[PDB]
Amino acid sequence: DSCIQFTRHASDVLLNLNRLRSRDILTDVVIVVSREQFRAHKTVLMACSGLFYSIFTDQLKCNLSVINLDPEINPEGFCILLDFMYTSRLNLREGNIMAVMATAMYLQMEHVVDTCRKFIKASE
Amino acid sequence: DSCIQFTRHASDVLLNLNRLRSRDILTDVVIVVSREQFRAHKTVLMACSGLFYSIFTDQLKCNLSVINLDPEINPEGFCILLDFMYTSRLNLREGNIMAVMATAMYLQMEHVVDTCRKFIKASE
């Protein structure tokens, strides 16, 4: 086509989706990770995670307002990944890298799994 | 903070949101523009438009499944802007620029209004 493109549009959209999440606006699901609860937009979770994409395209699970993750999932690792989904920024630290990588593998977030593998390899 | 950032994350999210729109997945509103109907995600519309942001933060309108736009709004102009919301690409042409700019003013999409003004000024 002969379209023009606004470079900052995708980033501005994601910024506004994170503002709606922070104010709990039109959030339609709560993700339960052991004792912790995280409110989010199903569409953003599906857009970021192969696991959520599979869950919310399922004809019965698409209608659930609560999703319980596997008990082995670490709440902090999930929180870090949810923040990444809504911002593009990943808070990867020596103290959390193992939990973040395991959570990213479970959530099927291949680019996160890739950077965790590389950061771990460099420390070996 | 000491976060790392994935450059293509926002673009990849927007691409997946457009794929969900094309397959009509988790769309929660229909925008009526005279004889034409457009299915979308309320969160994406709010993230892109000052008008939709105001509509869907309203305590009664946030729950509507149908929104009717002003009868002066051109369906093609709306279609072009909805495509822009989900892709960052604007199909701006001599034959549609007046309708696109008027629709962008109504929808409160300031960056689109700005490029239309500049493209019109150059042709004068």
Binding site: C3, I4, Q5, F6, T7 | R89, L90, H111, T115
Partner: peptide, 4 residues
Amino acid sequence: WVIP
């Protein structure tokens, strides 16, 4: 704005 750019030519993509």
